[PDB]
Write a protein that binds this ligand. Structure first.
Ligand SMILES: Cc1ncc(C[n+]2csc(CCOP(=O)(O)OP(=O)(O)O)c2C)c(N)n1
Ligand SMILES: Cc1ncc(C[n+]2csc(CCOP(=O)(O)OP(=O)(O)O)c2C)c(N)n1
Ligand SMILES: [Ca+2]
Ligand SMILES: [Ca+2]
Lengths: 807, 807
């Protein structure tokens, strides 16, 4: 569970001291100086004579525009943290403001504690400026290499989904979430505002949304800066917020007047947030209007108003660098010098290059610091879940009645197990769902918890399994559900979410950014401790989207995840729950895992159980296993064909084909694949089957019929350098299907049992079996015609039960 | 359950027809005519010449002031019921407006269907005017003898508690509840207004409170008529009502315009109530402001404006009769004649004496009639409870280890039993409690239902066992709990309420009124089918109010109920649950019971269990038993003294005395009274023990030591004519006690085991035993001193178990 840090939700009960504001104004000046430093200077950080074009970087990389606004807010938030003792994480939406985030960590001391080479003197300062967005150095964004970051802000949109995920089950946590006014135009951001109806002010922390209304994005004004102020205020009132607006920097008002006005506005906002938290201890079923701050300042604030007779301060022109070169002419270098000199660094550093005591006296200490708070390194908070005994959830009937028994909905088993994990790990585990938790059969969790809902209630006849507090959250937004969970994990908790397989593609780009976050962490951030995995139940999959049709038929997230499977990062898991027992073995491995995205493809549709839990754990350990109890061949040499499957439905059809092939006395080895990456080149993936183990399972020389859940391309790409790879006949999804029957779905994708049988016969001897083949092909048309005439599948398809069952 | 009658919550969707409103004014006129007739005329209803002073009544008995106003309202309600098809019960707050309710029943034709002797002609009018409030006739109030009444309104103040009880689990029922402005000054009424936070507009019906603001009570203006209209409006709004005011009859405005205005306002109020009922099918968690009608009309409306130079219309002087006598002078007869003529009775009756057809054409028919509605005759709705199996609740351990076993809280047993009653009779059974349901140990109910609460919710940390709908209701008003349950039974449902014994006295007057309702019903109202019994758990009793003290120590309710045990009405049960097993037997008896007020005196303290369920049934069947197993005497001749207890605690002390009498070789009978009315004079009660059965149990010649739960005066008055009654030595509560120990409570009322032992010896041989008697007296003064010194009771009192226990 999240730790209670400092003295939360405390009013100052006194005006902000003048000496604190002089601190903030000094922070701002030194942060802006460090920020311009990182962008423009390779050397001479303090402009010791001689200071020349030689000291300026050859390529200017990084963003000024957003930065001075961020520096202003973080200065004021640091003052606020020290005065109040408030557990604070910032979300930097404008992640391209990376200079503001590195400057923060430097100034609060966490940069030097984390990277000892980066000292507090002229030497460290030189290295600090140079290394920014520099080969062999650190990124342009508020990346995971930055202490204080749980949000890089590279792909804009997720500032609010992450803020709200961070405060869930974290009642002492305050999150200023700084939202770009351009970011506000993305879809993900636009729905994120609505998150204030899915958090409770007693059991969760508090998000303060801050609209960085600097008027501009890259090359355009922003919608929200160019609509009437009355429309802007209404918009945020209508999303359940109390909008405050701060305007500064558009006139000659002196900086200390600005700090006084801001510090007083912030404390008035803070006082309302404390009354919300005090009220929540008595009444947490009435949703308050949560403050938010419209922060309207000029983009590029404090840079030169004009450069080359073009407007730069208060323009889109300041977004990257207001001055495109400092090397090209004397005059341009002069501009950089007067700009850097405008902050008066001579008042900010002592002789040996360190920031003066009186610049940092107001700052917070120890774990309250932005860069040192454990919420911003949630692995140090993360505990192992108390897991219940896996054996308690096993489908025992496989052992009694034998392989292929029953018509169980596999995902109900993961539902029972996940229920009891929530029972034993209250406040540490959450399920998210895009209005699909029940549809994906995880509703067993409602036995120990509720859907968290902090909008209106109306009736017990409709409002089932809802409470203002609960470990399940649903909104119809893959972006919200991915976003919430990501931040929950990054702040040291655990969970899972489910989606219909086709609509996983809505958050492909979020999976990408989270993969990339994890790739960077395992590679080069050993201080950033492991977080619980992002566990995604991919269900209501293509083969059984026969009730919804072509729109809902796309297993392609497999292809997308395969694009994050390099360099032995081991940050991606792709699992095919063959059955309920294999789903348990995968759930066990995923729930115990850290630093991964786990895709678990599992049918929710009635299907057979093939494996005992013991057999499934043994198979999962390797990723693929021969099924000796289903093989007719006793060794590889005897085997005329290999029948391999990956997925509940490809396994059903391959297992049905095996039975028809066994009636013709064919010698065939059956193979199951639960771990896609177990098939990956041994050269790329040191956890994959060895080429000797691969050859053992799939044989060295025989024809392999491979029925795959997703697109054949997936497998054909993975096994390019595997032994016997040219003898893989890989059938998968083929962009065929509609509103039809389960049999038609596999038929039309040439993965139905009758086709898989015919293909095996073709691969053994098309001549010897030309007749049986022809008969199979005629049966396929017969079986379709049956569906069209009757409106359900032929009973040969429907009523089949593995020969190996005793009924 | 309560039946769905007519087309409930229907909008009219058109103006009221002129024809309908002509109807209502005729109704008003004829009902004013029938009402003055009942008060003043013994003969010659239609004033056929000669009409003289000899057609008047000698004694003028009945109330006018309220009646014209009631007649106006009832008329307009009948128009409403007929146009809409609305399930409707009225509550006549000013029950002294009896003439209005009888007038109603005659006109709707339920009077002639119930009393075929009272026909629709001059002959029937003559019987009808005579019979009213007249020897060997019918009462002055809206008594139970009147179809449409479930509320006499003799004892003012219960109008709203009855209205709100009536609507509970009755979603089709509409209850216009007419409240006197004088009734409003009473406590029970003043608190009754708040019942709108304890009812739900989906699962319960609607009460429309109508304040009959006629300006006056008997001799005084009413407070609510002489405060500003602004305060009046704010008052009702503050109590969660939408107040509507109708002012009429204080100017020369024509009757037909008054009708037009009123019907408009009525249909506007009805449209609101329909919108409330429609909304509630979707949102029944948000409490609406319920409409209420301030009806401001002159008291005595349509009486002479003056009589003998005294203001009568719009004055307290019309309260009874504005015409003090119609026989004292001729002038006074003229005033009566003129008054009766101003309704133009020749337009209302045909020369036959039938009320014409144009007068009733507008009226409701069938079961929608105020008279015919089954909710006003609840017995016709009353089903038997599906009762669970009494054996399933038995304390089995008395068989195992013998009489006197355990320290169980008896009320917990009653509570598990009643829990299962609710579970099996959903929407048919209710528990009421004045914030004492848990304190009296009846909270097992919370397993299957909740406390009904329709004010605000705030937190799951305080709002336990509470839903907007449930079968348990709690307010800190004994008047509300008693009132709600009364109306719940009258409308043909079942329930129980519990109270601290002392505080049952708050509602003595309501026990009186309901007993009298039941007395009259069983005597001469066979058409009024039998209603479920008013079952009252009387716990937290005098002996174990050692924690609260003197104020909480009053078992008087027994004394009060005995004053309603006559004529073999059998409308009062007074039971003492000896233990949990006696309580189950007493409970089943009460829950199957009808047309009774059952008072069940049972302790909630840890006590011994004396009887199996079979010994309990047996003992309860007759209402007293000899405990063979307890007696040392094997017959009545051998016995030296009879020990008798009524009540758990007297039973304990008597049984402990019995063990000290046993260890001195004394021979004694042990008797237990469970049903107090079994000791009643067999002259007075044909269910009481016969003088033979009595003398058998209590011997005919032996001295009887009687430990009585309550005041000794009770038993001393009940047995005045019983065998061996002068030999009864009755110890009971004697207004001694404080905040003290359990022993000191019995000690200071001379009913402790040591005094009971001493008295048994004093009644055998004051002299032979003067050494044991003196020693017992010295231990009483020595165990009290132990308790003062150590603050718990002497181990001899505390650790005692009956002889006949243990493995
Ligand atoms: C999803 C996405 N689309 C496009 C971009 C490219 N992009 C990066 S910064 C930016 C403008 C952002 O402006 P705003 O949020 O207003 O930031 P600020 O003014 O604070 O720099 C754009 C289009 C992106 N990073 N992410
Ligand atoms: C508790 C109680 N106290 C006193 C009375 C005696 N009583 C009968 S009528 C009456 C006045 C009632 O006036 P209101 O309710 O305003 O009746 P209305 O004006 O409709 O005649 C009184 C004091 C009573 N019935 N009940
Ligand atoms: Ca911007
Ligand atoms: Ca009155």
């Amino acid at each position: 569970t999240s730790p209670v840090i400092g003295t939360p939700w405390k009013k100052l009960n006194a005006p902000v001291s003048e000496e604190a504001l002089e601190g903030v104004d000094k922070y701002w000046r030194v942060a802006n100086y460090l920020s311009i430093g990182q962008i423009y200077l390779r050397s001479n950080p303090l402009m010791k004579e001689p200071f020349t074009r030689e000291d300026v970087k050859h390529r200017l990389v990084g963003h000024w525009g957003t930065t001075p606004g961020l520096n202003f807010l973080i200065g004021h938030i640091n003052r606020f943290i020290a005065d109040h003792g408030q557990n604070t994480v910032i979300i930097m939406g404008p992640g391209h403001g990376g200079p503001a985030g590195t400057s923060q960590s430097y100034l609060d001391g966490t940069y030097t504690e984390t990277f000892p080479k980066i000292t507090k003197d002229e030497a460290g300062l030189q290295k600090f400026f140079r290394q920014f967005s520099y080969p062999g150095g650190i990124p342009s964004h508020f990346a995971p290499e930055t202490p204080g970051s749980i949000h890089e802000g590279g792909e804009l949109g997720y500032a609010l989904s992450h803020a709200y995920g961070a405060i869930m089950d974290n009642p002492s946590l305050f999150v200023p979430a700084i939202v770009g006014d351009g970011e506000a135009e993305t879809g993900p951001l636009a729905t994120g505002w609505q998150s204030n109806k899915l958090v409770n002010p007693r059991t969760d922390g508090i998000v303060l949304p801050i609209l960085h209304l600097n008027g501009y994005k890259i090359a355009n004004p922003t919608i929200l800066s160019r609509i009437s102020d009355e429309e802007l205020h209404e918009f945020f009132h209508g999303m359940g917020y109390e909008p405050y607006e701060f305007v500064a920097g558009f006139d000659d008002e002196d900086h200390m007047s600005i700090h006084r006005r801001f510090a007083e506005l912030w404390e008035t906002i803070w006082d309302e947030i404390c009354d919300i938290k005090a009220t929540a201890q008595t009444d947490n079923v009435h949703r308050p209007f949560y403050p938010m701050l419209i922060f309207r300042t000029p983009k590029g604030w404090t840079c030169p108003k004009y450069i080359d007779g073009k407007k730069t301060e208060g323009s889109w022109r300041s977004h990257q660098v207001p001055l495109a070169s400092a090397r090209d002419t004397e005059a341009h270098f002069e501009v950089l010098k007067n700009w850097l000199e405008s902050y008066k660094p001579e008042e900010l550093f002592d002789a040996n290059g360190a920031v003066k005591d009186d610049v940092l006296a107001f700052m917070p200490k120890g774990e309250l610091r932005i860069g040192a708070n454990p919420n911003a390194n949630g692995g140090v908070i993360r505990n192992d879940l108390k897991l219940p005994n896996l054996e308690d959830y096993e489908v025992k009937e496989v052992a009694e009645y034998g392989h292929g028994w029953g018509q169980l909905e596999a995902t109900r088993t993961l539902g029972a197990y996940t229920r009891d994990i929530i029972k034993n790990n209250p406040r540490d585990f959450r399920i998210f769902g895009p209005d699909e938790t029940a549809s994906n059969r995880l509703q067993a969790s409602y036995e120990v918890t509720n859907k968290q809902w902090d909008a209106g209630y109306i009736s017990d006849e409709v409002d089932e399994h809802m409470h203002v507090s609960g470990q399940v959250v649903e909104q119809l937004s893959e972006h919200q559900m991915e976003g919430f969970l990501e931040a929950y994990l990054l702040t040291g908790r655990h969970g899972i979410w489910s989606s219909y397989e086709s609509f996983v593609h809505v958050i492909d780009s979020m999976l990408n950014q989270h993969a990339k976050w994890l790739e960077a962490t395992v590679r080069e951030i050993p201080w950033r401790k492991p977080i619980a995995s992002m566990n995604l139940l991919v269900s209501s999959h293509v083969w059984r989207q026969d009730h919804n049709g072509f729109s809902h038929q796309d297993p392609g997230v497999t292809s997308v995840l395969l694009n994050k499977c390099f360099h032995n990062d081991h940050v991606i898991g792709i699992y095919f729950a063959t059955d309920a027992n294999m789903l348990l073995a995968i759930a066990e491995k995923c729930y115990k895992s850290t630093n991964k995205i786990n895709a678990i493809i599992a049918g929710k549709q009635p299907a057979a159980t093939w494996l005992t839990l013991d057999e499934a754990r043994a198979e999962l350990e390797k990723g693929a296993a021969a099924w000796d109890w289903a093989s007719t061949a006793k060794n590889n040499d005897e085997a005329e064909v290999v029948l391999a499957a990956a997925g509940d439905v490809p396994t059903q059809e391959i297992m049905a084909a095996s039975d028809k092939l066994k009636e013709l006395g064919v010698k065939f080895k059956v193979v199951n694949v639960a771990d896609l990456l177990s098939l990956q080149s041994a050269k790329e993936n040191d956890e994959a089957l060895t080429d000797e183990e691969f050859a053992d399972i799939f044989t060295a020389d025989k024809p392999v019929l491979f029925a795959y859940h997703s697109y054949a391309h997936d497998v054909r790409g993975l096994i390019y350098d595997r032994p016997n790879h040219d003898n893989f006949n890989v059938h998968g999804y083929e962009e065929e299907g509609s509103t039809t029957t389960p049999y038609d779905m596999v038929r039309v994708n040439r993965i139905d049992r009758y086709e898989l049988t015919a293909e095996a016969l073709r691969m053994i001897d098309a001549d010897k079996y030309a007749d049986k083949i022809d008969e199979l092909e005629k049966f396929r048309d017969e079986a379709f015609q049956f569906a069209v005439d009757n409106g359900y599948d032929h009973p040969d398809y429907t009523d089949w039960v593995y020969s190996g069952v005793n009924t």
